[PDB]
Amino acid sequence: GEHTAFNQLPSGKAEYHGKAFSSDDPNGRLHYSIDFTKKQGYGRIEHLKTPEQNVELASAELKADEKSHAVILGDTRYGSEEKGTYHLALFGDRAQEIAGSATVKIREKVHEIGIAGKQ
Amino acid sequence: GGEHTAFNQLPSGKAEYHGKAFSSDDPNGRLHYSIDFTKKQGYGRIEHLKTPEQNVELASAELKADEKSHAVILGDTRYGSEEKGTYHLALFGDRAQEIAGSATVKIREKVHEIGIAGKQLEHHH
């Protein structure tokens, strides 16, 4: 439901699975891990038909945005090279859900990928 | 080519963006978005998604620099004037030719993620 407030973050670690969908491919999958104690998250997009869109969602810090909402802003990578960025927001009293998006630049073309996951 | 617009490379005037709005179950929506570069404000709307409540207003929000000096917009999503969530956009190209990001819409305690992307259709001063 509501955005998880940064100063209301649950304790420990969480694992998320869900969908990754581009404008022409609704069939990708998201895997994402959050360590609430270390304030860190990372994951990956998989199963999109374009191999280069199956990016690593590189290790990034869990921080507050200007509305005090718990967010993660990180880099997207493919073969260890930076391809763009991703933005995730946490939802629920226990950060049960994550949603946001990722960009992947392929041959000077930017691809926008919607991402969503649940514990 | 395809790089983030640096906040100090922003054009002036106003630009209109048209493009796609796509949820995990509906790839056929449309984005309309206006950026007033002089006032550093943007707003728009999502339309043509089959679920009426997903056709949100992307409320007026500030155009600012992110931590990498990239031009971005973070604002609220609304439907019937009520807040439904938030949206984020990033600007791409040396003249902010494109925008891409996403919007969240909460419907009956369920959060819906909508991918959004647009290209400059019109620019005036």
Residue numbers in the entry:
A (entry chain B): 201 to 211, 213 to 320
B (entry chain A): 200 to 211, 213 to 325
What does the study report here?
We have shown previously that fH CCP 6 and 7 (fH67) are necessary for high affinity interactions with V1 fHbp, and that these two CCPs are sufficient to inhibit binding of full length fH to fHbp. Here we characterised members of the three variant families by identifying amino acids that are critical for fH binding and through structural analysis, to inform future vaccine design and to understand the basis of the interaction of fHbp with fH. Here we show that even though V1, 2 and V3 fHbps exhibit remarkably conserved atomic structures, differences in key amino acids necessary for interactions with fH are only revealed by functional studies.
Attempts to grow crystals of a complex of V2 with fH67 were unsuccessful. Although crystals grown from a mixture of these proteins did diffract, these were found to contain only the C-terminal barrel of the V2 fHbp. This agreed with the observation that V2 fHbp is prone to cleavage to a smaller fragment consistent with the C-terminal barrel alone (not shown). The structure of the V2 fHbp C-terminal barrel is highly conserved with respect to both V1 and V3 fHbp even though it shares under 65% sequence identity with the V1 protein. To further examine the apparent instability of the N-terminal β barrel of V2 fHbp, differential scanning calorimetry (DSC) was performed on all three variant fHbps. The DSC profiles show independent unfolding of the two barrels with the peak representing unfolding of the C-terminal barrel melting at temperatures above 80°C in all three variants. The much reduced melting point in V2 fHbp suggests that the tendency of this barrel to be cleaved is due to unfolding of the N-terminal barrel, giving access to protease recognition sites within the N-terminal portion. The instability of V2 fHbp and its susceptibility to proteolysis are not desirable in a vaccine antigen, and might explain why it has not been included in any vaccines in clinical trials to date. Such instability is less likely to present an issue in the context of the protein on the exterior of bacteria where interactions with surrounding molecules are likely to stabilise the structure, rendering it competent for binding fH; however it might explain why more C-terminal residues appear to be critical for fH binding compared with fHbp from other variant families.
